[PDB]
Amino acid sequence: ATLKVIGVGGGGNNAVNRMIDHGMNNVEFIAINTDGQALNLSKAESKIQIGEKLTRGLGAGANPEIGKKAAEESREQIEDAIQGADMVFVTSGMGGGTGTGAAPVVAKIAKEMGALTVGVVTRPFSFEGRKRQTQAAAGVEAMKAAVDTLIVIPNDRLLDIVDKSTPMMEAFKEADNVLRQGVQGISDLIAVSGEVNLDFADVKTIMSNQGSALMGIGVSSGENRAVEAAKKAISSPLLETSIVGAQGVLMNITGGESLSLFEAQEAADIVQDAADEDVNMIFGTVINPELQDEIVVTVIATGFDDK
Numbered sequence: 001a002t003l004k005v006i007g008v009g010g011g012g013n014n015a016v017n018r019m020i021d022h023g024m025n026n027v028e029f030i031a032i033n034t035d036g037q038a039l040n041l042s043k044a045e046s047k048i049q050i051g052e053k054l055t056r057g058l059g060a061g062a063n064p065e066i067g068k069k070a071a072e073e074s075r076e077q078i079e080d081a082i083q084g085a086d087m088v089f090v091t092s093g094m095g096g097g098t099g100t101g102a103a104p105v106v107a108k109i110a111k112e113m114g115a116l117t118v119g120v121v122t123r124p125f126s127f128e129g130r131k132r133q134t135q136a137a138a139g140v141e142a143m144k145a146a147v148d149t150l151i152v153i154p155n156d157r158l159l160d161i162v163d164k165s166t167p168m169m170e171a172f173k174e175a176d177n178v179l180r181q182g183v184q185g186i187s188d189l190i191a192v193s194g195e196v197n198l199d200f201a202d203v204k205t206i207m208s209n210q211g212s213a214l215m216g217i218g219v220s221s222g223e224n225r226a227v228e229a230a231k232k233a234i235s236s237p238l239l240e241t242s243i244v245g246a247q248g249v250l251m252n253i254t255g256g257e258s259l260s261l262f263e264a265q266e267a268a269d270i271v272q273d274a275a276d277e278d279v280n281m282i283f284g285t286v287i288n289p290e291l292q293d294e295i296v297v298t299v300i301a302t303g304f305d306d307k
């Protein structure tokens with residue numbers, strides 16, 4: 001299955017560039033921007049400049065109407081870059097002119113090209129002011145209507161995970177981790193035949209036309225490793241959507257030859273208990289003999305009923 005990561009606007013493009021810098025294979029990066037200057041600096045193999053006649057190579061200067069018009073006019077260029085994709089991840093910062101307006105258009109195009117469409121967007125910091133928050137909210141709602149599943153990261157949550165000295169770029173890398181882990185994790189699920197196999201169809205079942213989603217990973221070792229990894233996987237300090245309310249979960253447990261049945265049940269019970277509703281679980285398991293004493297629990301949670 002073909003996986004594509006699309007950065008729309010300033011923040012989306014930045015997330016794409018920091019992910020390339022980190023290292024990712026089997027994934028195509030597409031950079032979409034009105035801003036020609038930022039595009040020339042993109043590390044993405046695929047670059048699409050939208051609304052060149054509309055903005056003259058500049059940004060959309062906080063007007064979502066410009067980003068929407070710019071993406072529509074370049075529908076053909078967007079389709080060609082997407083072509084072949086089975087799954088499309090659209091990343092954008094909401095609140096600006098480009099991301100807010102263009103990202104939902106890009107998402108609708110991917111969805112109409114038969115791609116499983118996942119949005120990973122940020123809401124602006126409260127310090128950016130009320131009008132920026134209002135425009136982002138309209139962009140978030142438009143994103144929800146265009147994608148299969150939407151993961152929202154309020155930028156204010158980054159202030160909950162930093163200390164007074166944490167560099168801003170390091171804080172931004174922590175938000176990139178949500179998308180990065182989700183992308184790498186899905187790619188791995190598709191590439192590896194697990195002892196209890198999960199494949200692209202299982203990803204579609206959990207993600208198609210769902211609305212809100214939670215994505216998480218937890219790594220743990222030693223005593224109580226399964227419970228610890230599962231609690232970490234469902235913890236959402238950066239996410240708007242919490243595990244509470246999830247009615248559907250795709251959950252995978254990766255472990256060495258020591259992976260016990262008892263601990264797989266302990267881990268699945270943490271997920272079932274945390275949700276508050278009975279969850280329809282799509283359970284997976286992988287035996288990686290290289291992991292030794294480490295256990296990795298991955299979760300994709302949906303069924304919040306809000307598309």
Ligand SMILES: Nc1nc2c(ncn2[C@@H]2O[C@H](COP(=O)(O)OP(=O)(O)O)[C@@H](O)[C@H]2O)c(=O)[nH]1
Nearest residue numbers: 009010011014093094095096097098099124175
């Ligand atoms: N977490 C994060 N947020 C960003 C980043 N860059 C921009 N933002 C946020 O995204 C919103 C829109 O900015 P931007 O993507 O540059 O605007 P655009 O190019 O017009 O769509 C800003 O209001 C900030 O909240 C980034 O690198 N990381």
Ligand SMILES: NC(=O)c1c(F)ccc(OCc2nc3cc(Cl)cnc3s2)c1F
Nearest residue numbers: 182185189192194198216252284285298
């Ligand atoms: N049981 C399997 O067929 C299998 C596999 F053989 C390799 C990896 C797997 O899952 C990896 C994942 N990693 C992540 C991270 C996030 Cl943040 C969300 N979801 C996932 S799913 C699997 F489910």
